[PDB]
């Protein structure tokens, strides 16, 4: 085509989706990770995660307002990944890298899994 | 903070939101522009437009499944802007620039309004 492109558009959209999440606007699901609860937009979760994409395209699960994750999933690891989904920024640290990588593997977030593997390999 | 950032994350999210729109997945509103109907995600519309942000933060309008735009709004102009919201690409042409600018003014999409003004000024 002969379209023009606004470079900062995708980043501006994601910033506004994060502002709606912070103010709890039009969030349509609560993700339960052991004792912890996280409110989010189903569309953003599907856009970032192979696991959520599979869950919310399922004819019965698409209508659930609550999703319970596997008990082995660490709430902090999930929180860090949820923040990444809405911001592009990953808070990866020596003390959380194992939980972040295991959670990214479960959630099917291949680019996160890749950077965790590289950061671990460098420390060995 | 000490976060790492994935450069292509925002663009990848927007690409997946557009794929869900094309397949009509989790769309929660229909925008009526005269005889034409456009299905979309309320969150993406709010993230891109000052007008939709005001409409869907309203305690009564937030629950409507149908929104009717002003009869002066051109459906093609709306279609071009909706495509821009989901892609960052604006199909601006000599034959549509007036309709695109009027629609962007109504929708409160200031960056689109700005490029339309500059393209018009250059043709004068």
């Amino acid at each position: 085509d002969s379209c023009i492109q606004f470079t900062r558009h995708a980043s501006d959209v994601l910033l506004n989706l994060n502002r709606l999440r912070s103010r709890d606007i039009l969030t349509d699901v609560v993700i339960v990770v052991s004792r912890e609860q996280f409110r989010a937009h189903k569309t953003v979760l599907m856009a970032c995660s192979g696991l959520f994409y599979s869950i919310f395209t399922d004819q019965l699960k698409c209508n659930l307002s609550v999703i319970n994750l596997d008990p082995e999933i660490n709430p902090e690891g999930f929180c860090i990944l949820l923040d990444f989904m809405y911001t592009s920024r990953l808070n990866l640290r020596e003390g959380n890298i194992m939980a972040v990588m295991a959670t990214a593997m479960y959630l099917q977030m291949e680019h996160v899994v890749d950077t965790c593997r590289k950061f671990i390999k460098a420390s060995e | 903070d000490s976060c790492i950032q994935f450069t292509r994350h925002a663009s990848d999210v927007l690409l997946n939101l557009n794929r869900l729109r094309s397949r009509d997945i989790l769309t929660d509103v229909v925008i009526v522009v005269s005889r034409e109907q456009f299905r979309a995600h309320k969150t993406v519309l709010m993230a891109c437009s000052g007008l939709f942000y005001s409409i869907f933060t309203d305690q009564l309008k937030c629950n409507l499944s149908v929104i009717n735009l002003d009869p002066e709004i051109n459906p093609e102009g709306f279609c071009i802007l909706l495509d821009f919201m989901y892609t960052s690409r604006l199909n601006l042409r000599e034959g549509n620039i007036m309709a695109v600018m009027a629609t962007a003014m109504y929708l409160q999409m200031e960056h689109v309004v700005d490029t339309c003004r500059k393209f018009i000024k250059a043709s004068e």
Binding site: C3, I4, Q5, F6, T7 | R89, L90, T115
Partner: peptide, 4 residues
């Protein structure tokens, strides 16, 4: 704005 750019030419993509």
């Amino acid at each position: 704005w750019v030419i993509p």
